[PDB]
């Protein structure tokens, strides 16, 4: 299960955040700042995997904005990367040429998609079209 | 002993750099930003940084920090004075201090930086004098810099000889939450805008307590200034000998003298405020302002800042005179009064809501600050006696001066 | 800018 997911920009600004662990607000902010500093203080050949606080912090950003995750040391590492790629593809398909500008303005849609896709740090739908159809049906309800 | 004077920005980019000694590599500026971020995030941030054996002592400007790298045991006071002089020169030359002029006025900025300091030792700091040798829109340097008088360019001619003075008062009061005033200091400010023909030698004369005692008139209203700081034009020896304030006024507005003495009188405004803040239910602001100043004086633009709750919403104000508005940006009640006659009494009754959920952390009690500014009122009682304007050619001067009384560090501690 | 670029460019 993913302990937390944080979408942070290259400049350090965070565009998305979803933590599955009940932590204090000050503690959560400190953890986010430390993760941003570590990711921002990492090269392009770091393997996209960091063992921070006994958590497999996987960083894989496909654009200026980077992506982060917190997976416990009990599952495979490539699974997190595959899940991140699938989520990015689903968001791009739902939005259509998703860029950084649409992420800030359309944060609610991204949060709804993440909730409908991953719940409690675990996956909810393995397919990529069923989740999109469900999201579209929920949005069309008004 | 600065090694390289550089101008940074809010994003860490160095707007402009000017090495003076070259003993420090230009790449050390990159570590200044992470060091400043670490110091600020840990509470150890200071204007004087230190990148190993190189010290980065600089101040924060309006938009960028003027950081000057140094490696040896250079005088920090000298570096601060040079930075202040550079800021003043930039303000005099450029009406705004922002990144818009740094990237647009580099042609004159580089020349000014090169001419001002050589080898880490500044030589010229007068904006008026420097404007005759470095321009953004070059002849030989003026003889004023070479001559002793480097603050009054010779040959200045005007149709009229009018000098405008400004006796600005700064009423600073530090009143504790118990109702007693701890720090009550009034700092005089004699700012004059001299506009005459030639190079007159002004002979300032006031009713100083020391001067009256020396002359034998130590029985009338005499100003007892604990600290008197004359400008560069004022001769220190003349003042030290027999309290003779003789100096050549500059061309323009400048600070000639700045008196600073303690005040033992009652506050001009007495503020009686109460906080009937219910436990997450409501709040009451029984603020009453009593003017202890003379009735003949009116405090123009009275602004008594009352710090209200940060999370307070839906507030109601029941005042008597003056418009009261709550600014969410500042999180306080702005008791704005246009005209406040002396001896007036304004009563206010605030009432605002509070959320049921308590705040996560304490916010503190900011002090209540009043912004009273009553012109034509000299609290210290110091009055200008004479101004000896002497010129070799010979002319009849028409000096002018005005007394302005305002509130300086007049903060009131909250309960 | 660098923000208007697509996350994956597909």
């Amino acid at each position: 299960m993913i302990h937390f997911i944080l979408l942070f920009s290259r400049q350090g600004k965070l565009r998305l955040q979803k933590w599955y662990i009940t932590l204090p607000d000050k503690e959560r902010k400190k953890i986010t700042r430390e993760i941003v500093q570590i990711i921002l203080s990492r090269g392009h050949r770091t393997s996209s995997f960091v063992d921070w606080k006994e958590l497999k912090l996987v960083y894989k950003r496909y654009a200026s904005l980077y992506f982060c995750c917190a997976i416990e040391n009990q599952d495979n590492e490539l699974l997190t990367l595959e899940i991140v790629h699938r989520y990015v593809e689903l968001l791009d398909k739902y939005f259509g040429n998703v860029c950084e500008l649409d992420i800030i303005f359309n944060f609610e849609k991204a949060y709804f998609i993440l909730d409908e896709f991953i719940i409690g740090g675990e996956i909810q739908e393995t397919s990529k079209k069923i989740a999109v159809k469900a999201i579209e049906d929920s949005d069309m309800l008004q | 002993s600065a090694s390289a004077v550089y101008v940074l920005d809010l994003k860490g980019k160095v707007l402009i750099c000017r090495n003076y000694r070259g003993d420090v590599d230009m790449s050390e500026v990159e570590h200044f930003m992470p060091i400043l971020m670490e110091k600020e995030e840990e509470g150890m941030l200071s204007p004087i940084l230190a990148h190993g054996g190189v010290r980065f002592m600089w101040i924060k400007h309006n938009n960028l920090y003027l950081v000057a790298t140094s490696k040896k045991n250079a005088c920090v006071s000298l570096v601060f004075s040079f930075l202040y002089k550079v800021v003043q020169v930039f303000s005099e030359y450029f009406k705004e201090l922002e990144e818009e002029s740094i990237r647009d006025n580099f042609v004159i900025i580089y020349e000014l930086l090169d001419e001002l300091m050589d080898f880490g030792y500044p030589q010229t700091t007068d904006s008026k004098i420097l404007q005759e040798y470095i321009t953004q829109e070059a002849p030989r340097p003026p003889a004023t810099v070479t001559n002793a008088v480097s603050w009054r360019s010779e040959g200045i001619k005007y149709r009229k000889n009018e000098v405008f003075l400004d006796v600005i008062e700064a009423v600073n009061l530090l009143v504790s939450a118990n109702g007693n005033v701890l720090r009550s200091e009034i700092v005089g400010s004699i700012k004059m805008r001299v506009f005459l023909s030639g190079m007159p030698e002004l002979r300032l004369g006031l009713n100083d307590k020391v001067l009256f005692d020396n002359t034998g008139r130590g029985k009338s209203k005499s100003v007892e200034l604990e600290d008197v700081k004359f400008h560069q034009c004022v001769r220190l020896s003349r003042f030290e000998n027999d309290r003779t304030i003789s100096f050549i006024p500059p061309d323009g507005e400048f600070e000639l003298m700045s008196y600073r003495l303690n005040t033992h009188v009652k506050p001009l405004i007495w503020i009686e405020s109460v906080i009937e803040k219910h436990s997450h239910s409501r709040i009451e602001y029984m603020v009453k302002a009593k003017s202890q100043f003379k009735r003949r004086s009116t405090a123009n633009n009275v602004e008594i800042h009352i710090p209200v709750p940060n999370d307070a919403d839906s507030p109601k104000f029941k005042t008597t005179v003056g418009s009261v508005k709550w600014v969410p940006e500042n999180s306080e009640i702005v008791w704005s009064v246009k005209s406040f006659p002396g001896g007036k009494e304004y009563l206010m009754r605030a009432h605002f809501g509070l959320p049921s959920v308590e705040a996560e952390d304490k916010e503190g009690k900011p002090p209540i600050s009043v912004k009273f500014e009553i012109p034509y009122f000299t609290t210290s009682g110091i009055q200008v006696r004479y101004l000896k304007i002497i010129e070799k050619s010979g002319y009849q001067a028409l000096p002018w001066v005005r007394y302005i009384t305002q509130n300086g560090d007049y903060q009131l501690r909250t309960q | 800018k660098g923000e208007n670029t697509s996350l994956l460019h597909p």
């Binding site: - | 045991n73 004022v234 916010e363 | -």
Partner: protein
């Protein structure tokens, strides 16, 4: 881009040359490595317009160390420009020659420097004085061979007070790096001549003129009296550094003045208003002023004895100034202003800065320790702060109470009952250990000392080494004082710290305590529960040798950091 810029710079049109120079300057300032085009701009150097000459000189100075080989094509241009009729052009050429960090270029610049040393133009003289110092810093041997020391010495005794100040500053900089051999010191006549031009020096020249006197050591009171009389007018300067320099000079000269004469009293009386004025400087200079006051406070504390109201920290004061304000108040704290200090500390304890709160607590504790007349007031303030129910404030109050009890525990038995139930659940090692030590040493006014130690014995084997040692000491003291209610407690502590305790120091202490208990419990009362001597408080006053040396280094980095100049320079 690069080719187009090179073509524009290699053109015969001045309108394109100026634009190319501006673009090159902007690219270098914009962060573009334009050092590859240094040879191209070398040809377009001898220009009549001063606007392009300055930019070319700046580019060469910024591109001198990068391409020293390509800089060999500028010596002739510099020599030609060193004779221009315009003083500005000559000054710019002299400044550019000294700014070029080229080993093979400074050798040929000796002749232009010698020619411009005796320049009639004061700007030319100042430029030559600066260039001589720059060359000496770059190459001391070359400067010594050129014989510029004699010319620099004669500069101070000439006209042009700005040029004289510049020459004095250059000589001081050269002697600063010199090994003190062949110093440029002057007799009283030179000091009088410098003082004569001191009143005509500029704002920057005043510092240079006053720095020379910082090295001269007066030998007679008459000379010291004259120096003090001449430096007295410097206290009325609008410049903050000038006032600080004058104060430092007066402090240095006071080492030879006689306190019997009235000159010392007049100097002391005329210095407090200067300190008050300097305390109202900019926030950046506030830290420097506080450091200077702290350095001078430990030497002559009788000057600012009555300056206490101005030491109060303002609401908008910076953190670096707020922290120094507490230290200044503690240094100037006395029984006369004890109530004011306590009131200020009470107001400073209601803020939200954890570091500020800790600093205020430490200052209050130091003031209480220094002055025993306000011990009761400090104890009451600490009790009120503890009752304030603040975790950090509670830890600070516990630490302050523990520190006070070790120093003045004779009349500290009236607060043990209040501290008996003061939310002992705090896990701060600095507060829990202090509370345990207070309970062990003050286990007489608390009837439930054994019960309180029971809660702290649950995790004694894994709490901490210092905490475990303090708990063991408290248990031993309780057993020695009252062994009826702590007979089994002592045995349990010995078993837990001797069998289940793997700490070497802790294990040794437990074994020693067990041996003492099993050898002579009666002797343990006179051995363990003995009357310790008076605790020697850590004096905050600096050593007299460092204070005398720190007196000469005033306004520099060695004074702000409170460290010797050789312990911080690299």
């Amino acid at each position: 881009e690069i080719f187009e810029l090179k073509a524009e710079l290699n053109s015969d049109k001045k309108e394109k040359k100026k634009e190319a120079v501006k673009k090159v300057i902007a690219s270098m300032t914009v962060g573009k490595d334009v050092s590859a085009l240094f040879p191209d701009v070398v040809n377009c150097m001898q220009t009549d317009n001063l606007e392009l000459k300055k930019l070319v000189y700046l580019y060469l100075m910024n591109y001198a160390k990068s391409q020293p080989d390509m800089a060999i094509m500028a010596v002739n241009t510099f020599v030609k420009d060193c004779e221009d009729p315009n003083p500005l052009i000559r000054a710019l050429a002299v400044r550019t020659m000294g700014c070029i960090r080229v080993d093979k270029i400074t050798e040929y610049l000796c002749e232009p420097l010698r020619k411009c040393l005796k320049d009639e133009d004061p700007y030319v003289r100042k430029t030559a004085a600066v260039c001589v110092a720059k060359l000496h810093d770059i190459n001391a041997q070359l400067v010594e061979d050129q014989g510029f020391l004699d010319t620099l010495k004669d500069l101070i005794s000439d006209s042009n007070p700005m040029v004289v100040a510049n020459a004095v500053a250059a000589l001081s900089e050269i002697a600063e790096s010199h090994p003190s051999s062949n110093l440029l010191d002057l007799n009283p006549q030179s000091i009088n001549k410098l003082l004569t031009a001191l009143n005509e020096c500029t704002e920057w020249g005043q510092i240079f003129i006053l720095d020379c006197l910082a090295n001269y050591m007066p030998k007679d009171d008459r000379e010291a009296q004259s120096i003090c009389e001449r430096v007295t007018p410097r206290l009325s300067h609008a410049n903050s550094a000038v006032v600080l320099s004058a104060v430092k000079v007066l402090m240095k000269f006071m080492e030879m003045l006689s306190k019997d004469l009235d000159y010392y009293g007049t100097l002391l009386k005329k210095l407090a208003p200067p300190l008050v004025t300097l305390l109202s400087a900019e926030p950046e200079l506030q830290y420097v002023a506080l450091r200077n006051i702290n350095l001078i406070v430990q030497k002559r504390p009788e000057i600012l004895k009555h300056e206490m109201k101005v030491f109060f920290v303002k609401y908008n004061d910076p953190i670096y100034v707020k922290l120094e304000k507490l230290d200044i108040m503690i240094r100037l704290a006395s029984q006369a202003n004890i109530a004011q200090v306590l009131a200020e500390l009470r107001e400073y304890a209601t803020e939200v800065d954890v570091d500020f709160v800790r600093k205020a607590v430490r200052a209050i504790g130091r003031c209480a320790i220094k002055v025993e007349q306000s011990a009761e007031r400090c104890v009451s303030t600490l009790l009120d702060l503890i009752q304030t129910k603040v975790n950090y404030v509670v830890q600070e109050a516990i630490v302050v109470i523990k520190d006070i009890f070790r120093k003045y525990p004779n009349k500290y038995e009236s607060v043990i009952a209040t501290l008996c139930e003061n939310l002992d659940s705090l896990d701060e090692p600095e507060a829990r250990a202090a509370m345990i030590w207070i309970v062990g040493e003050y286990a007489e006014r608390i009837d439930n000392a054994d019960e309180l130690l029971e809660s702290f014995l649950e995790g004694f084997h894994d709490k901490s080494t210092q905490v475990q040692l303090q708990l063991l000491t408290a248990i031993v003291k309780l057993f020695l004082k009252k062994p009826t209610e702590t007979q089994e407690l002592v045995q349990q502590v010995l078993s837990l710290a001797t069998q289940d305790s793997d700490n070497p120091d802790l294990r040794d202490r437990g074994y020693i305590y067990w041996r003492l208990l099993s050898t002579d419990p009666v002797a343990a009362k006179e051995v363990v529960l003995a009357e310790k001597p008076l605790i020697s408080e850590e004096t905050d006053l600096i050593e007299p040798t460092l204070l005398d040396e720190l007196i000469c280094y005033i306004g520099t980095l060695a004074s702000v950091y409170h460290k010797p100049p050789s312990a911080f320079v690299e």
